[PDB]
């Protein structure tokens, strides 16, 4: 039989419902269970896992009709794992008001509306033809449909179970099907030999949580795991000393950050947020912890934005004396401020925090670490500072500044950021404008306001480091996922 793949992972999602699984740890599992209409081919034209090319997947072809609609022709006789044939009805349900973006969808997918485009209801023309559309102009439908928002779920099965139970017993069209989920311990998938695309090359995949990275490394060295995730560049020398192991790393389209609970009195105003931001010496963290491999962006601005990336933008500010003055002007009294982290779910989370605590002591702010267990996120009102990350999930600047930090987003609605009205007006403008000078300048003004307000502080794009047995052939992609289609072989 084919070899079973054993992965030692940093964490596991709380649900395998594909939108609710959006996180650093969910896509590497839900990418196997499900498919999208259009897939990003990271290896197109020989690229080393960072190509942006969009290719047919569950849609054999597609055509943009106008500024707000795209018609998809579906591949025929594709089956879900439970035997049901994929049709336009499943695709329409996936992108419906009911399941995803309407007010009724909040109880199934809490972030569905905030992360979605301004969709109108899909139009089904026939069993294999469906149009996705927006109420207002959107040139983002194709990048949205290739993203992690857009894995296709089975309508009747999903409605029968509901989103919570579906998340514990998922059914998709992908190359691996669900076996078991032991919350906070493992996920096991098995080969779907009825798959429509490249046939699965592992017989089974096990995602085993190993929360401590030292234990994870020891497990690779002992022969317990084939691939391990979420290492730091500081682990590269030891792993690569073993002739039968190696590291495989890449910059990913994600940024690490810290952010604030702006419902808390000390963070309602921008002054102390800005003071903490101005004291972070990012290049010294990149040198000390990342062996130079992480990348520090010029604001909320990344190359994968394409036409809305600004390569002439100045670096984010670093000014210890201005930071000291802001601490004084804020009235901060020396009381300790907590910073919550789920151990090293993020690579270098605790080492980075320890360095930042020292940087903050030098401006007169006392920050203390508080840890929380995998899957035990604290009550919001017990949090002040916390770490987070955002995957830059479109080939456009809309994500993640608008979905996360916009007026309909969680940073304003849940976490209390009182954004300037100008910022929210610009979010609405960029959503509907085509690319050009106006949209480009609007994102730059949004970036400036973001730095002025500091609702979050961007640290860097991580250099994502995996380690693997040399006899397990698999290349990383420039995103917070693992791809095995035509990218997994043994021997
Ligand atoms: O970025 C993660 C975000 C995603 O919603 O929530 C956090 C908060 O700790 O993680 C939680 O959700 C993911 C996905 O279900 C789980 O894997 C974590 O264990 C859980 O804490 C962010 O890390
Ligand atoms: O795993 P985590 O950083 O919490 O996941 C984020 C998610 O919360 C959203 O911001 C999109 O980017 C990541 O997956």
TrEMBL record:
List where in the cell it is found: Periplasm
Report the Gene3D superfamilies cross-referenced here: Dipeptide-binding Protein, Domain 1, Dipeptide-binding Protein, Domain 3, Periplasmic binding protein-like II
Claim: Repressor is one of the keywords in the record: no
Query: Which keywords has UniProt assigned to this entry?
Result: Plasmid, Signal
One matching Pfam family: SBP_bac_5
Q: Name one GO cellular component term.
A: outer membrane-bounded periplasmic space
What InterPro entries does the entry give? Peptide/Ni-bd, SBP_5, SBP_5_dom, TAT_signal
Summarize where alpha-L-arabinopyanose binds, as residue positions: 24, 388-389, 391, 404, 480
Name of the molecule in the record? ABC transporter substrate-binding protein
Source species? Agrobacterium fabrum (strain C58 / ATCC 33970) (Agrobacterium tumefaciens (strain C58))
The gene coding this protein: accA
């Amino acid at each position: 039989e084919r070899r079973a793949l054993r992965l030692g992972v940093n964490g596991l999602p709380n649900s395998l419902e594909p939108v609710n699984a959006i996180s650093n740890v969910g896509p590497r599992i839900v990418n196997q269970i499900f498919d999208t209409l259009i897939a990003r081919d990271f290896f197109a034209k020989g690229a080393p896992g960072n190509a942006i090319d969009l290719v047919p997947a569950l849609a054999e072809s597609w055509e943009r009709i106008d500024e707000k609609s795209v018609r998809f022709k579906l591949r025929q006789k594709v089956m879900f794992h439970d035997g049901v044939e994929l049709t336009a009805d499943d695709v329409a349900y996936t992108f419906s008001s009911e399941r995803l973006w309407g007010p009724e969808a909040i109880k199934k997918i809490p972030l569905g509306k905030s992360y979605s485009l301004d969709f109108d209801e899909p139009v089904v023309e026939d069993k294999y033809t469906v149009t996705l559309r927006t109420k207002t102009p959107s040139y983002l439908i194709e990048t949205f449909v290739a993203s992690w928002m857009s894995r296709i779920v089975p309508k009747e099965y999903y409605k029968k179970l509901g989103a919570v139970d579906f998340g514990n017993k998922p059914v998709g069209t992908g190359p691996y099907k669900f076996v078991e989920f032991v919350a906070g311990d493992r996920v096991v998938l098995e080969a779907n030999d009825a798959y429509w695309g490249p046939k699965p090359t592992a017989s089974k995949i096990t995602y085993q949580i190993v929360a401590e990275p030292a234990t994870r490394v020891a497990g690779l060295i002992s022969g317990e795991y084939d691939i391990i995730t979420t290492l730091t560049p500081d682990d590269i020398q030891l792993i690569n000393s073993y002739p039968d192991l190696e590291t495989r790393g890449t910059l990913i389209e994600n940024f690490h950050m810290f952010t604030f609970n702006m419902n808390q009195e000390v963070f309602k105003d921008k002054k102390l947020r800005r003071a903490l931001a101005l004291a972070v010496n990012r290049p010294i963290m990149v040198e000390a912890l990342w062996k130079k491999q992480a990348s520090i962006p010029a604001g909320f601005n990344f190359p994968n934005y394409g036409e809305t990336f600004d390569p002439k933008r100045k670096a984010m500010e670093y000014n210890v004396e201005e930071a000291k003055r802001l601490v004084k002007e804020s009235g901060y009294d020396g009381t300790p401020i907590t910073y919550h982290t789920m151990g090293n779910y993020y690579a270098n989370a605790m080492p980075a925090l320890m360095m930042m605590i020292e940087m903050w002591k030098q401006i007169g702010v006392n920050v203390v670490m508080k840890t929380y267990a995998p899957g035990s996120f604290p009550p919001d009102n017990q949090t002040w500072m916390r770490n987070w990350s955002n995957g830059q999930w479109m080939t456009d600047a809309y994500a993640t500044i608008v979905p996360e930090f916009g007026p309909n987003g969680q940073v304003q609605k849940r976490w209390g950021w009182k954004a300037p009205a100008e910022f929210n007006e610009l979010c609405q403008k960029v959503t509907v404008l085509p690319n050009g000078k106006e949209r480009f300048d609007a994102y730059n003004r949004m970036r400036d306001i973001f730095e002025e307000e500091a609702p979050a502080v961007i640290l860097y794009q991580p250099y994502d480091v995996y380690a693997a047995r040399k006899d397990v052939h698999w290349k990383p992609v420039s995103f917070e996922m693992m791809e095995f289609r035509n990218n997994l072989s043994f021997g």
